Symmetry: D2
Subunit: 326 residues, 4 copies
């Protein structure tokens, strides 16, 4: 049996309600030890070692946790055959993409969560954990980048996102589809992500204890410029725009971000629309404003890649080339 | 013997052009309503069409003043026509549609339409979209359904309709509760109507209003700044909508700022950046303890529309939560 | 607390394998009392009684069980406040539509199953059954036709279909959307079906012991006319065509069906395409041939309505009017 | 300095038309490949296009003869051109695409295209679909991805592509594993390629083949007749595909007819009427005991293509299962 390390961070998968009958819950109260021997069947497919990194709801995920995870994985790579990270669902898709760019281990790294409390009727977390361990154990999972395993599906860390606030089936790679499906402890892989990931990216966080400051502003009818201005006034390194339609900006936001970009703030146009690329060549002259188009990266994904691009360059053309390769 | 249909034009890519039929480049102010209407001569087989230019903007620059002008016009002119079609940019068409759905007192058909391809592009979607919009507005079965959006041969209620994709001609969907009807051969089979209260069944009356309460939206993500939320509180915003993570959760620092603002009277609505599903009561956030409101299926930009209108009526969070359960 | 009757028919919800972590299972050997006390929380929301009607896999569902179920619901309507029917997934969409057309009882009738057997890790059956009893107990559920409740969702019996072979979230109302979502035992209903159902249909099976014979033929490139001919030779009352695209037929199948319709066989054009109407006024002049256009009914749903239509009329124009109203 | 691109025309609504732009009615494959081309002058900006008419039929009448003809012509003319577009009806485009995906030995781009609206209708999709199909066939990056379908600005692999909606312009989706890339402003960002073996990586050779093994499809449902199954068996079909219920299950009487056929030599594949997901092994059916093959993600019309070609190599059920695990 392969050795698999579980790195725990908290989440609904470690968290419970007063009741199985009721929807209410508190996040990340169970330790990884307790999580693992609640699924005795993991012992049939791996030798599982648990380590607790942090124990938070993922709605409070942060750069320090990210840097701890990436360095822990890169250091401990030769000690184990694969990793599974137990994590809250709310921001699993951001951590997954961060790790997808910063992990240099080409062994399987699999993230997993639960949409129901571990005390709830028909709790999803047990079988999710089991399938995550199946994926991390499968020799075919290597060299695919950092993965998310939810609802019997293996999803790439770059495309995966949430489709629904509560559904057990919420995690989907909404633009390019999944990599494979898990049935009876076996995976039929038919896809791998063509974007460069893991050991094929320049991003190296081994000596970083903080990341560039990147905030996200929303566009909508009558949008205030005050959020954008607040990030500019604090000296943020970059701003991501959650654009309306194909990455478009409300006029007051457009003005503020055009000004910021002139003074060297990196600006990435993404979209609040859940699927499709924010393209070049549409209504915005990105060349002229010094903006970057996010492509299929949603706002929170574009934040991950922009924070990391800014560790290598402040140059908008070079950042755009980063957004075309990773 | 054909219905009288008014077109209220606001601009949008439907009225927009670039220099090549086969390059994506375009701008939005290009074609007036007269020229828009005359380019689809098949309209005169189904309706007597009159066109009025209300504004001419990209809907990325839609704003409270345009909403108020459109509601008051539709309400004032209800008796002069059999139905209304509004040409509009796609980017914020879902927000305008919900604003009209809550403030229009006319129960004749109001249908919104736009185009995901410019008028000059090969296989331009705007002509057939506008034709189907006029079909919808002329169908007496369209009445009493609220304000509608018609795109890609589908009839969508103004509450649930939203964009699913940045560029796809099929992007407009009612992602939580489905469409009202599909259009085939100029006929509609309706199998649904929205249960939530709309148009003449709301208390929202903008007839005397010249501005709306100030509501901002803040995004949640890992390591989110509280600076956007703090800037809105410092500017005296009447309400703030949180685009939460998962089931409407907030990053700790955002949470701390909004819990403080709610104590001082700021209306706070928790919604979700996740494109489908309710932001529910009775999950991780004790809304009754902080004075917060859960948005239900209303996404952040929709939640903004209803909160602005709620704040014309009340400042009490229990009353705003009741509005969010009924409209 | 309301009185809820569980009419059990078998299915995966009552199905079991040899391991929590192997996909193998069988149906048809586990009784309703086992399901009811796998969900002790039911006692918090209802006074439940279980009756075993049959114990089958729904792949073997048939006209006799349909007739049994409609009669029993219609007969026992006064004895309870609502019904839940436990049922296999595979043909749940057929039974739900039959009962939507034939039940005259004014109380909630809710169907439920499970995509994982009762023995699996993270079995979906217990919370589905709890949510189905919440649904049947909800006064707001009345007057909405026969319902299916799967994965925290209330689906109408006409539109509901399977979208995926294995996904717990497979059940969707793919053309018109769900009626309501369930969270913390509460439903927010925002829709009701416009098509006529239950006590508003002329279908009455109270004394029928069989149903007219209606079979389904599939269309594809180089399709054999031998399936269609085998139904015609056997004197079938009706044939449903799973059409290509918008209800189209391969030349040989069309010829066999145009002939059958001239002898008085009823022919409904439906589509193998899983969403969208088979329309009138496309490539097939239905009036010229004596054919009926299924609208949004998929082939197996079209068979349900065609069987019931033939209990009243053999007339093509009258059958089309039934396909326009139910 | 432009690629040479060959258009092979087969008919389909992308060629012919209704009496009207306003009305839904139409007749299929009445325009020659030549109308098609001249109808899109911008093709000359991106390629040197030459058209040949192979057949001129509605794709609801696609057949084994057209498949053989197409595969042989593409394998013959591979050396003469830089890539192929095939204009085809929508209705069975997904079966011809998998067929060519398994039989074409040319690793130059082969892209299939159609139109969900008649050539004569308002906002016809056929022109820009054809532009995009030519863009795909011209893009050096499209080589070695197997046979493609290009519809609604999306590049789809031949194996997974299928119809999702009877009439929507956006009906074509790779419903299990997603598209290979999206087309904007005439450029494609490929992020995927299919891992299943195709074109020159398959043993299927139709070059000397004037017919295919007989494979029929049977439908399952509540109270399913065994008479369709019995009929194909009586006619000594080489293969039967079951469109099963749920995860490839069969009605008792169909099960028993197909069990009996498999024990005497007939190749039996369980597929599913359910539009997504695999028909798996190790569910309710002991496939090894009955001599059945599980179709995986192949829907019944797709499973028929693969079973016919497998039967040109082998009759052995464990060998057909190996082909169903590999292509």
């Amino acid at each position: 049996l392969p050795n698999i390390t579980i790195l725990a961070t908290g989440g609904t998968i470690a968290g419970g309600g007063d009741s199985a009958t009721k929807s209410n819950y508190t996040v990340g109260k169970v330790g990884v030890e307790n999580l693992v021997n609640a699924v005795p069947q993991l012992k049939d497919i791996a030798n599982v070692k648990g380590e607790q990194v942090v124990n938070i709801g993922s709605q409070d995920m942060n750069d320090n946790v990210w840097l701890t995870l990436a360095k822990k994985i890169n250091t401990d790579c030769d000690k184990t055959d694969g990793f599974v990270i137990t994590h809250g669902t709310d921001t699993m898709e951001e951590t997954a993409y961060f790790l997808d760019l910063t992990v240099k281990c080409d062994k399987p790294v699999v993230m997993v969560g639960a949409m129901r409390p571990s005390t709830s009727m028909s709790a999803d977390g047990p079988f999710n954990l089991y399938n995550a361990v199946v994926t991390a154990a499968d020799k075919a999972s290597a060299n695919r980048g950092v993965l998310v395993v939810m609802n019997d599906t293996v999803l790439d860390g770059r495309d995966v996102t949430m489709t629904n606030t509560t559904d057990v089936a919420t995690f989907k790679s909404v633009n390019y589809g999944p990599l494979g499906y898990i049935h009876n402890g076996k995976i039929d892989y038919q896809r791998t992500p063509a974007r460069k990931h893991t050991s094929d990216t320049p991003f190296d966080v081994s000596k970083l204890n903080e990341l560039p400051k990147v905030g996200i502003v929303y566009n909508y009818a009558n949008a205030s410029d005050l959020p954008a201005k607040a990030l500019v006034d604090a000296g943020y390194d970059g701003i991501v725009s959650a654009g309306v339609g194909n990455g478009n900006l409300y006029k007051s936001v457009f003005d503020t971000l055009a000004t910021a970009a002139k003074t060297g703030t990196a600006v990435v146009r993404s979209s609040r629309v859940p699927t499709g690329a924010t393209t070049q060549d549409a209504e915005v002259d990105d060349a002229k404003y010094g903006f970057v188009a996010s492509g299929t990266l949603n706002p929170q994904k574009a934040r991950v890649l922009l924070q990391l691009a800014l560790t290598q360059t402040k140059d908008p053309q070079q950042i755009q080339q980063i957004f075309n390769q990773y």
